[PDB]
Design an enzyme around this catalytic site. Sequence first.
Site, mmCIF file in Angstrom:
data_model
loop_
_atom_site.group_PDB
_atom_site.id
_atom_site.type_symbol
_atom_site.label_atom_id
_atom_site.label_comp_id
_atom_site.label_asym_id
_atom_site.label_seq_id
_atom_site.Cartn_x
_atom_site.Cartn_y
_atom_site.Cartn_z
ATOM 1 C CG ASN A 1 14.678 -27.663 59.136
ATOM 2 O OD1 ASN A 1 14.450 -28.278 60.212
ATOM 3 N ND2 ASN A 1 15.768 -27.885 58.401
ATOM 4 C CG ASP B 1 16.088 -29.750 64.793
ATOM 5 O OD1 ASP B 1 16.801 -30.436 64.043
ATOM 6 O OD2 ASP B 1 16.355 -29.615 65.997
ATOM 7 C CD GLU C 1 16.494 -32.100 60.442
ATOM 8 O OE1 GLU C 1 16.561 -30.917 60.831
ATOM 9 O OE2 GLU C 1 17.451 -32.907 60.535
ATOM 10 C CE1 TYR D 1 17.400 -29.992 55.806
ATOM 11 C CE2 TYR D 1 17.001 -32.350 56.080
ATOM 12 C CZ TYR D 1 17.703 -31.207 56.415
ATOM 13 O OH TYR D 1 18.646 -31.269 57.426
ATOM 14 C CG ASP E 1 17.143 -26.046 55.332
ATOM 15 O OD1 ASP E 1 18.053 -25.473 54.679
ATOM 16 O OD2 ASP E 1 17.323 -26.499 56.492
ATOM 17 C CG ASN F 1 21.060 -27.450 54.043
ATOM 18 O OD1 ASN F 1 20.467 -28.535 54.239
ATOM 19 N ND2 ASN F 1 21.563 -26.728 55.031
ATOM 20 C CG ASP G 1 14.701 -22.025 56.054
ATOM 21 O OD1 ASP G 1 14.254 -23.138 55.967
ATOM 22 O OD2 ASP G 1 15.525 -21.716 56.900
ATOM 23 C CG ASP H 1 17.987 -25.991 64.156
ATOM 24 O OD1 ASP H 1 16.988 -26.366 63.476
ATOM 25 O OD2 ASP H 1 19.063 -26.613 64.132
ATOM 26 C CG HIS H 2 15.912 -23.942 60.165
ATOM 27 N ND1 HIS H 2 16.341 -23.742 58.865
ATOM 28 C CD2 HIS H 2 16.687 -24.935 60.670
ATOM 29 C CE1 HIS H 2 17.340 -24.563 58.605
ATOM 30 N NE2 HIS H 2 17.567 -25.297 59.683
HETATM 31 CL CL LIG Z 1 20.679 -32.875 55.163
HETATM 32 MG MG LIG Z 2 17.889 -30.093 62.216
#
Ligand SMILES: [Cl-]
Ligand SMILES: [Mg+2]
Length: 275
Positions: free
Chosen positions: A25, A27, A53, A128, A167, A169, A240, A265-266
Amino acid sequence: LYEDPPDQKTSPSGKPATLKICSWNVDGLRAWIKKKGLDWVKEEAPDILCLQETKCSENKLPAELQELPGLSHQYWSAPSDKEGYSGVGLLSRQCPLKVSYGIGDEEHDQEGRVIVAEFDSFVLVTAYVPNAGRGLVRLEYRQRWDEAFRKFLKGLASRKPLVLCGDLNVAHEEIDLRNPKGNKKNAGFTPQERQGFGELLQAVPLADSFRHLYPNTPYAYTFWTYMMNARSKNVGWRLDYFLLSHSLLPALCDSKIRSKALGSDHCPITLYLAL
Ligand SMILES: [Cl-]
Ligand SMILES: [Mg+2]
């Protein structure tokens, strides 16, 4: 404190790894490129690179991308002006037999979240999964997502061995995040989401590659909020995954968490298989 163990590149029966898959991911592709995301990826030199993302609504891909050495077969969520759109990418040294987009369910196919690449010996899905939202505003939607996604994947797995990465989540267990008690009511650690992830593992079925290899290891995270320097303190979540059909476990050599790789940020995760 977490230190990823050295790369193990042989299977349980001694076969050399033949496939290296990296998932990340990012970002936002452009921000990720600015932060040297692509330099890292060229060092890793995976056979397949899955990105989540991308935020690539606009038709134009950066030139740095098409030029990425070795990974010439590149598939991206179709660019869209749709609000809520996320974008994923799947980049491959080898041309896949077949590439598909989405999960055949219109509610869940508007935001560029899923790519399917079929190869001879297995199918690769990158996803994602929708965040449940601030104050859990998208929770009910996430539950409909988990069910449609589970069913879609159960369908693919019935034809060919499945690798799902991305990801997802959700942090599966308490060991999967730094602060489990404080997050019971936050996106990523609700009982609903943990339950959806358990049903996913059972129904397809799928195994969690990292946790299969490293069942007791704490502080192994894959995401840290930019807020309040969470990464410095390793105040993190494992969101992840590489999830594998059980039939691929004898091909599994290692599943890595690239803790120090910067850019997002991942952090990236990496999978070695002997196929
Ligand atoms: Cl999302
Ligand atoms: Mg992000």
